[PDB]
Amino acid sequence: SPIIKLRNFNNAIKYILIDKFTRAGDVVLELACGKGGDLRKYGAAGISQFIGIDISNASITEALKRYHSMKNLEYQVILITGDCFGESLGVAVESFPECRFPCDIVSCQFALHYAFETEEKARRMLLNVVKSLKIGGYFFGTIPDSEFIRYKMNKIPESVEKPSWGNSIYKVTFSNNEYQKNGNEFPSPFGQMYTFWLEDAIDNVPEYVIPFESFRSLADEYGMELELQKGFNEFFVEEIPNWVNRFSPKMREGLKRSDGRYGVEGVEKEPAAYFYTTFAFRKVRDYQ
Ligand SMILES: Nc1ncnc2c1ncn2[C@@H]1O[C@H](CSCC[C@H](N)C(=O)O)[C@@H](O)[C@H]1O
Ligand SMILES: [Ca+2]
Ligand SMILES: [Ca+2]
Ligand SMILES: [Ca+2]
Ligand SMILES: [Ca+2]
Ligand SMILES: [Ca+2]
């Protein structure tokens, strides 16, 4: 189905992205790790320790259940219920002294935009990231692409009170049209809410825009400089040749279009390949 193909595609994106920035021996902190479904991707990249934190205890309980069913892992796994964005990370990790901080990588998949609820939370998130990382370490992940959101929003006239677009498997509905009323510009980088539906994945959840220019500028204030901002489509096109013969021959089959080549097509193309972007930054200096 379209949604199965979207999930396979996103998993391939994550496999490639994790391998790109993770190397043998690394310690990874995964913010907003959810149910912890990427452990084997970090394992394949050779990590020595995984630390996952999520605000949802239900998700962490499930992440722990999944982890405990695994056998003979070469790396340590620490899973913590805690707020990664609105509170200092020291609160969450105080009772887990086995965590090896500073770490080599911080990752955050399909979640960092939650930190853009307010400026306070965006800055607390960035402080948590830089203080956790070694100088030279990387911060990477996957977020809704504000540049694609702005393209869609620029095609919606100001007369529409709740700007919306979508297709048979996904929908975006903005809470207000302040963007269009403000000359097609968000009045603030923070708290710009839209409801997001993705079939069998995201049940009409309020989400916040993460304007990339603001994210980049803020990151620079905390000593992090841009490494990557390719949209999912371009990232996949460029990386899949290194990657065809490495994937699970079933995941390989799951990445095949009708025309026989690798990617996504049909109703899944827009949410899978355009709506999301990769991101990465490198910590080049200490936040003083
Ligand atoms: N302040 C916060 N601190 C930590 N996790 C948070 C958070 N606000 C939201 N989250 C988490 O953000 C996640 C968004 S869904 C993405 C989860 C996971 N990374 C995946 O790719 O499947 C949820 O697991 C949610 O509980
Ligand atoms: Ca703050
Ligand atoms: Ca704007
Ligand atoms: Ca740069
Ligand atoms: Ca780039
Ligand atoms: Ca791109």
Author numbering: 138 to 425
Relevant lines from the article:
The essential enzyme messenger RNA (mRNA) (guanine-N7) methyltransferase catalyzes S-adenosylmethionine (SAM)-dependent conversion of GpppRNA ends to the m7GpppRNA cap structure characteristic of eukaryal mRNAs. Available evidence indicates that the antifungal activity of SFG is exerted via inhibition of fungal cap methyltransferase Abd1.
The two protomers in the asymmetric unit are nearly identical and are superimposable with an root mean square deviation (r.m.s.d) of 0.4 Å over 289 Cα positions. In addition, KlAbd1Δ137 contains RNA cap methyltransferase-specific structural elements: (i) an α/β domain (aa 281–346) composed of a four-stranded (β6–β9) anti-parallel β-sheet, helix αE, and a 310 helix; and (ii) a C-terminal three helix cluster (helices αG–αI) and a 310 helix, together spanning aa 368–411. In the KlAbd1 crystal structure, SAH occupies the methyl donor site in a conformation similar to that observed previously for SAM, SAH, and aza-SAM in Ecm1 or RNMT and SAH interacts with an ensemble of conserved residues in a manner similar to Ecm1 and RNMT.
